[PDB]
Amino acid sequence: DLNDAQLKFANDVESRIQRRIEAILSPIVGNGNVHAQVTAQLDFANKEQTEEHYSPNGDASKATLRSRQLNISEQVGAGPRSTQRNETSNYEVDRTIRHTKMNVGDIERLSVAVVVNYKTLADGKPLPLTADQMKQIEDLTREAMGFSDKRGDTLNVVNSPFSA
Amino acid sequence: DLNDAQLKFANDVESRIQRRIEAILSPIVGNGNVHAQVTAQLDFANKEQTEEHYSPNGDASKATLRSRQLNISEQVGAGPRSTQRNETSNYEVDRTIRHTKMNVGDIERLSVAVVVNYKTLADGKPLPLTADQMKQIEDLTREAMGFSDKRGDTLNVVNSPFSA
Amino acid sequence: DLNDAQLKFANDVESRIQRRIEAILSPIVGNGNVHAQVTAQLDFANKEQTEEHYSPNGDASKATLRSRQLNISEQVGAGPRSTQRNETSNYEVDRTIRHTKMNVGDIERLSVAVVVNYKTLADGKPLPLTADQMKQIEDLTREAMGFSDKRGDTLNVVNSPFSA
Amino acid sequence: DLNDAQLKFANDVESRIQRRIEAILSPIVGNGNVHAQVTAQLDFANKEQTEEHYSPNGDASKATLRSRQLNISEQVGAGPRSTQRNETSNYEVDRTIRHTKMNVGDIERLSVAVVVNYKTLADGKPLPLTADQMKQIEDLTREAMGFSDKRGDTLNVVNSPFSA
């Protein structure tokens, strides 16, 4: 029931990422000379979070006060000195409440496998690509897939001649 | 259901960013001599936040007072001196409450992949572009995509001859 | 639903900024010899704010009083002196409450990309523009776009010959 | 009843992982020259979790205070010294409540078995593949299956000639 809807959601996301990669990889490598497939680890767990933050007021310069009683006594007779300080302070503090409801269906970790073809010249020899072109393909695929390191995304692009 | 609506929202945003990039990249590079694709990491999490800020009043110059009782006693007989100061102060403080409801569907991180063609002169030789022109294309794409560093936007523009 | 309305709002704002830029850039550079595109980062977050400000009254010259009790005693017998001052003061303070509801749909950051053509004389040679003319175009575009530094606006105008 | 629905859910997930692997393994190894089967250990246990986190306030620099009473007495007569410090502090602490409902049907551990064929040249000799090609197949399968180490995923790809 709901599981099938989630699976179809994942399939559509993967297909659209695949198409976005293919769109940029087509003009330079050529139609059919590139194949990519995407798998997506998604987030279907309902989470609700409330965050409370208090600004520190331990420093007297940023401390906000409402009432303060400072009783000071010094009975000098060091000799028979007698110092007494009774201090009472009531503070008002900064407060920030944030309520967050995470979206259901977010992407947790995306791994993408891309395979490119060789280059057959007018003679027909399948000449492999170069390192610079491979790096360009890797960068383009990283851009298309929305590659990020916090998610833990992995990308692998290899070059090999396609079968007949 | 709602996930499909969010996905269509993302697709429309990406398509419009793509079209905006293409619009400026067309007059100089030429029709079809430029291809770009956009992916958008969006924000579909409902957040509500209330912020409270208190202006500090620790300095006597900016401190606002309502009532103040200052009892001072000095019984000089340092000898048998006896100083006593009882101070009570009630303050009124500046207060700023901000209530914020973040919009659903905002952009978190935008990464854009742009590929340009080579230059075929009247002879037909695919002459590659220059560094200055590449920098101009990068700047134009950054302007079109709304490039920002707080979001974490990444842009990659590479030059390569298009396939037939 | 609402997201589409917000997107159309952004598109209309961007189109009108584009048209305003084109309107002034047309008479001097010429029809079609200028192309500009605008992207707008907008504010669709409902914010409500209440601000309270108290005028400081720590200086006796600007302090407003309602009731004041000053008991002073000096029993001179420094010898066996005995000074005692009990002071109680009730103040009335200036107060300013400001309630603000920010508009939904305001502009946060505007970045604009403008491209101009070269100058083809009667012979037909595409002569590039000059530094003074480029500075004039930059100033005119800044004026049209409502360029501001608090927002974080970025503008890029480059000169390049248009393609056929 | 529900068990059959869960089993069909597992079968669909396994079939889609199998198809994703086959899709990338087809262009290079060839149609029919690759066979893969997937088994999935799934999560059909309803879990509900509430998490509470308190920011530490043991350091006076990050400690937020509401009321503080500090009575200090020093009766010097080390001699007949008498120090007494009575300190009472009321704190306000940061608080974060997270409520999480894990999705039913998540993947716990995925193990995948892939078998590839040999290479029969124009002569017909079944030449085995190379180490580099085997490593490429392993990497592609890891990418397709969403291989992860936290889950405990295991992958085994072996090379052997297919039977008639």
Residue numbers in the entry:
A (entry chain A), B (entry chain h), C (entry chain g), D (entry chain B): 229 to 305, 353 to 439
Copy text from the publication.
The bacterial flagellar motor is a huge bidirectional rotary nanomachine that drives rotation of the flagellum for bacterial motility. The cytoplasmic C ring of the flagellar motor functions as the switch complex for the rotational direction switching from counterclockwise to clockwise. The basal body is made up of the LP ring, MS ring, C ring, rod and export apparatus. Here, we present two high-resolution cryo-electron microscopy structures of the C ring-containing flagellar basal body–hook complex from Salmonella Typhimurium, which are in the default counterclockwise state and in a constitutively active CheY mutant-induced clockwise state, respectively.
To obtain the C ring-containing basal body–hook complex in the CW state, we constructed the constitutively active double mutant D13K/Y106W of CheY (hereafter referred to as CheY**), which can mimic CheY-P to tightly bind to the C ring and lock the rotational direction of the motor in the CW state. The density maps of the LP ring, MS ring, rod, hook, and export apparatus in the CW state were locally reconstructed to the higher resolutions ranging from 2.8 Å to 3.8 Å. The MS ring is located on the inner membrane, houses the export apparatus and forms the assembly base for the C ring. Initial two-dimensional (2D) classification analyses of manually picked particles revealed that like the MS ring, the C ring adopts a 34-fold symmetric architecture. In the intact C ring-containing basal body–hook complexes, the MS ring is more stable and harbors much more clear densities for the outer RBM1 subring, outer RBM2 subring and putative inner RBM1 subring, which are made up of 11 RBM1, 11 RBM2 and 23 RBM1 domains of FliF, respectively. The more stable MS ring in the C ring-containing basal body–hook complexes indicates that the C ring is also important for the stability of the MS ring during motor assembly. Although the structures of the LP ring, MS ring, rod, hook, and export apparatus in the CW state are highly similar to those of these components in the CCW state, the protomers of the C ring in the CW state notably undergo inclination and compaction, suggesting that the binding of CheY** induces significant conformational changes of the C ring for rotational switching.
